[PDB]
Design a protein around this ligand. Structure first.
Ligand SMILES: Nc1ncnc2c1ncn2[C@@H]1O[C@H](COP(=O)(O)OP(=O)(O)O)[C@@H](O)[C@H]1O
Ligand SMILES: [Zn+2]
Lengths: 626, 348
């Protein structure tokens, strides 16, 4: 039989429809919406199906409804019309009822509890209500299907209206007129009938493989290529192909977690803790910790994207593969790629026409699959020139335009790029300029936001610092919180640069400008990194402290202070006479200011701000008893 | 009975074999899948003693006396110890060794021997077979996937295509699964070696892949009357008699060699604080002096954390080879010995 009882279920829902609340949170849910639905000129309701698990009896209905979803929905349609009629004229709150009474309605639950996944379903689970999620790839054009058949008698012109029931066409045998009764006289007119839209949308399903979905009526063309989708429909396989008759589609934590987030947000060692906790296997590298982390935070997206990209110009023995391999896991799911093992087709796509669909179809490459996420490109120095040409438009407009035989179209591949590149030769050569140690053209090398020069020096002292860190780690914040933090930060914070932070950028950029390769590309990093720092701070505006720290980070990443302004070479070491004179001149002025004020002494905090606009110099004076 | 069968399962299935020509099929009815005994042999091995060298001496006695090289094979066959540190970060438990040398020295026989000894060994020559030898095809996995949790032996490594070597680098770095111990053999790029040139100049492979190796022994087919006299006598006796001329030594049979390696595989040695300080002291001592070796431009590679972690894996292997529950200093010194021995071939 049927688990659904016609009168029992409509009574059970009637109690739910008038008594449901979540636990001002105390207000009833649909006591408010019922009036709003009568106001609406819509033809259906997307029912808040998460309410079913939020109430006791509704979950019991769900298990009962698991095998009979159609019957209740059909009953709800009449119930909706009856609810409209009762609220309009029986409650005497409205009088516009004519169109509603004659027409037909539907209801769509959208947040039902998910099932045990696609591949885990069973032959008896066919025709049962399910809930799935996935990504839409392709869409078929509008396909009409028969609903009403129009027959005209070919000898007397009499017309009949015949409607299909359960997919059956019934040909009348004789004309229904009293006089004209010629057998088989009824004829079908193709273009006097009535049709309904049927569309097939292709979904890449990730169970709680790709499944070809199906939609009907107003649900067609509501789903388009690249849409992020959750499915509430019926798993189907009929005499046998696996497909889902989509009933509804969705186009898309505790307060204790908020307390946990705020504790890390409030503590002063926030940046220190993040570096200390992001990569246990990698020792120190404070700036590199700040670098990739700011890539994951990302800037703000306005219409101007925040896709920060980083080049690791380190020596070819520093753990950087140990990072990006680890980055691919910790980050929200992206794609791990190698420049050596990738091609222009491999990154972008292969696009071709389809006979059935009569419009372009795409086979997404590595780069496109990372749309909206993060991708890692190892062996960036070994990428083919044709493939490298793609990145120019990717890192300037996040789009790729193709114009070849029979195909002219543009795509979108908005993504973040993490790039690691060994120096030319077996090791970095500081005796040559930095731009000559990197095997990348200036047009491509300029558009990266951050370039990091990680060098390894043979120092016995620093060797023990690194060695004892690793050697004891393999004897004998968690990733769950870290991902929870990043997802929280990306979700909420959209900082806006303040007036004070804006003006400092001018002096910061001009200073690098007059030292010239300081193109306007690096000015993008002067805002992109600024927003990502405030987002980590969770401050809803970008602070000047974020601005100056990011500028310092760019300076430290490129090592400007250790780079020759003449030929671009790097100092190996990065007591001097200039240190002497500065200390001497500082000491001379301190001896005056300490006594020029109308006191024998003053606080050192005020003294520093008086002259800096020091501790060693005054300590030496104390040693000399001055 | 559904979902009792999965692809790749070696099973015994009972069913009704069912069908003017008639096609046939079977309706399954029942589905099933497919130590003191060896410890006594282990006790005999312990009774004989010299376990570290007996196994190395037992590795292909028909091959000339590359004892220090075959010792690397013993540790590679045993392998290191994996360390999932946490947060998804990984440290490989495999050992990679290269075998460079001139052609005609029959070095490929050791590749056959090691692959034969290992129960999960896959053998490969030159470029991948029809391209599908690497990665997978429309998926049918290649040699590297086939040798998962095993050993892959490659002859003429340098001749592999860029795509062939590209898949090699990912497995050498990520082990995906393609958890493999890589044993490579390659002829000199010029046909014959030139000691006056750097190893990178004499081979097609760059430093990016060679730095991923643990031990990088080089074979030089130097014509010397002294050495060749012993090797010729060694080989000519191998053809005359079905055993090596060193009849005073009784080699361990491959099954027992395999069993002890499997027995060793179960163990897990752990570092002590005494060896912990010794390892960092030896690392610092070797790294600082190795600067001169690279400055002389007459050494295979500079001392980097490849040496620190390489010894750690080798010391773990040596300790696990000795069935030791903890790592000792002599394993570290022996590991340091073999690493330093490998450089000696460049100075012939
Ligand atoms: N600072 C470091 N922290 C941890 N491991 C390191 C460090 N420097 C080198 N290593 C080790 O050296 C090896 C080299 O790997 P890596 O530098 O990531 O890529 P590549 O082998 O291409 O240089 C790795 O196994 C890594 O564990
Ligand atoms: Zn008629």
């Amino acid at each position: 039989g049927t688990n659904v009882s016609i009168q029992e279920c409509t009574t059970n829902f009637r109690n739910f429809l008038m008594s449901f609340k979540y636990k001002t949170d105390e207000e009833l849910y649909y006591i408010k919406q019922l009036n709003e639905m009568r106001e609406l000129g819509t033809s259906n309701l997307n029912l808040d199906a998460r309410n079913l698990l939020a109430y006791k009896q509704t979950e019991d209905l769900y298990h009962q409804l698991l095998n009979y979803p159609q019957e209740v929905i059909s009953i709800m349609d009449q119930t909706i019309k009856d609810c409209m009629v009762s609220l309009i004229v029986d409650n005497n709150l409205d009088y516009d009822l004519d169109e509603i009474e004659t027409k037909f309605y539907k209801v769509r639950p959208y947040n039902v509890g998910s099932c045990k996944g696609m591949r885990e379903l069973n032959p008896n689970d066919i025709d049962k209500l399910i809930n799935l999620k996935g990504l839409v790839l392709r869409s078929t054009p509008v396909i009409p299907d028969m609903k009403v058949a129009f027959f005209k008698c070919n000898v007397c012109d009499h017309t009949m209206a015949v409607e299909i029931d359960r997919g059956v066409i019934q040909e009348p045998a004789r004309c229904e007129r009293i006089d004209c009764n010629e057998p088989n006289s009824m004829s079908l007119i193709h273009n006097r009938c009535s049709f309904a839209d049927k569309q097939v949308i292709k979904l890449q399903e990730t169970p709680d493989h790709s499944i070809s979905l199906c939609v009907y009526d107003e649900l067609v063309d509501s789903c388009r290529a690249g849409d992020r989708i959750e499915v509430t429909g019926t798993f189907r396989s009929i005499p046998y192909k696996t497909y889902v008759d989509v009933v509804h589609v969705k186009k898309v934590i505790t307060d204790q977690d908020l307390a946990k987030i705020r504790e890390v947000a409030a503590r002063e060692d926030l940046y220190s803790l993040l570096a200390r906790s992001i990569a246990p296997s990698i020792y120190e590298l404070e700036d590199v910790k700040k670098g990739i982390l700011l890539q994951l935070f990302g800037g703000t997206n306005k219409t101007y994207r925040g896709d920060i990209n980083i080049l690791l110009c380190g020596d070819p023995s520093t753990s950087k593969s140990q990072i990006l391999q680890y980055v691919h896991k910790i980050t929200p799911r992206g794609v791990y790629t190698s420049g050596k093992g990738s091609s222009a087709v491999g990154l972008t796509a292969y696009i071709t026409r389809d006979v059935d669909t009569k419009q372009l179809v795409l086979e997404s490459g590595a780069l496109v699959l990372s749309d909206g996420g993060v991708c890692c490109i190892d062996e960036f120095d070994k990428m083919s020139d044709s493939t490298r040409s793609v990145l120019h438009e990717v890192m300037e407009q996040q789009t790729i335009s193709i114009a070849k035989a029979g195909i002219i179209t543009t795509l979108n591949a908005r993504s973040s790029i993490l790039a690691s590149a060994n120096p030319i030769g077996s090791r970095y050569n500081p005796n040559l300029p930095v731009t000559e140690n990197i095997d990348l053209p200036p047009p491509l090398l300029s558009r990266f936001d951050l370039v990091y020069l990680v060098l390894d020096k043979v120092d016995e002292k620093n060797d023990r610092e690194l060695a004892k860190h690793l050697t004891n780690l393999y004897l004998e914040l968690p990733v769950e919180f870290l991902t929870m933090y990043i997802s929280y930060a990306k979700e909420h914070i959209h900082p806006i640069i303040t007036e004070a932070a804006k003006t400092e950028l001018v002096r910061a950029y001009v200073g690098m400008r007059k030292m010239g390769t300081a193109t306007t590309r690096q000015l993008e990093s002067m805002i992109r990194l600024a927003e990502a720092h405030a987002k980590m701070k969770l401050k809803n505006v970008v602070e000047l402290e974020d601005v100056q720290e990011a500028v310092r980070l760019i300076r430290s990443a490129i090592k400007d202070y250790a780079t020759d302004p003449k030929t671009g070479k790097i100092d190996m070491n990065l007591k001097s006479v200039i240190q002497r004179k500065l200390q001497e001149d500082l000491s001379r002025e301190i001896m005056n200011v300490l006594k020029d004020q109308a006191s024998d002494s003053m606080s050192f905090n005020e003294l520093i701000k008086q002259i800096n606009e020091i501790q060693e110099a005054l300590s030496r004076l104390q040693q000399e008893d001055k | 009975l559904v979902r009792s069968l999965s692809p790749g399962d070696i099973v015994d299935v009972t069913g009704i074999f069912l069908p003017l020509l008639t096609e046939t099929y079977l309706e399954a009815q029942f589905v099933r899948q497919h130590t003191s005994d060896v410890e006594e042999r282990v006790m005999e091995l312990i009774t004989s003693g010299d376990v570290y060298n007996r196994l190395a001496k037992s590795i292909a006695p028909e091959i000339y006396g590359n004892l220090d090289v075959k010792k690397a094979l013993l540790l590679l066959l045993v392998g290191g110890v994996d360390k999932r540190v946490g947060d998804g970060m990984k440290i490989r438990g495999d050992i990679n060794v290269c075998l460079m040398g001139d052609p005609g020295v029959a070095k490929s026989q050791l590749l056959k021997a090691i692959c034969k000894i290992s129960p999960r060994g896959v053998y490969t020559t030159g470029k991948g077979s029809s391209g599908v030898g690497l990665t997978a095809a429309v998926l049918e996995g290649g040699a590297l996937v086939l040798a998962d949790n095993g050993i892959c032996c490659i002859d003429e490594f340098d001749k592999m295509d860029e795509s062939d070597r590209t898949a090699i680098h990912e497995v050498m770095e990520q082990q995906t699964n393609a958890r493999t111990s890589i044993l490579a053999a390659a002829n000199p790029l010029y046909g014959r070696y030139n000691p006056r040139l750097s190893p990178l100049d004499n081979i097609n492979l760059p430093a990016a892949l060679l730095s991923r190796f643990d031990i990088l022994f080089l074979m030089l087919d130097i014509p010397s009357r002294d050495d060749d006299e012993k090797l010729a006598e060694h080989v000519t006796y191998v053809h005359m008699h079905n055993k090596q001329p060193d009849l005073d030594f009784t080699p361990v049979e491959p099954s027992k060699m395999r069993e002890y390696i499997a027995y060793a595989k179960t163990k897990r040695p752990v570092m002590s604080e005494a060896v912990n300080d010794y390892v960092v002291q030896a690392y610092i001592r070797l790294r600082q002096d190795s600067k001169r070796e690279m400055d002389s431009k007459f050494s295979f590679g500079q001392a980097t954390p490849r040496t620190l972690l390489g010894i750690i894996r080798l010391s773990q292997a040596l300790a696990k080879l000795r069935l030791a529950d903890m790592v000792d200093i002599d394993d570290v010194e022996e590991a340091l010995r073999l690493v330093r021995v490998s450089k000696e071939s460049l100075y012939q």
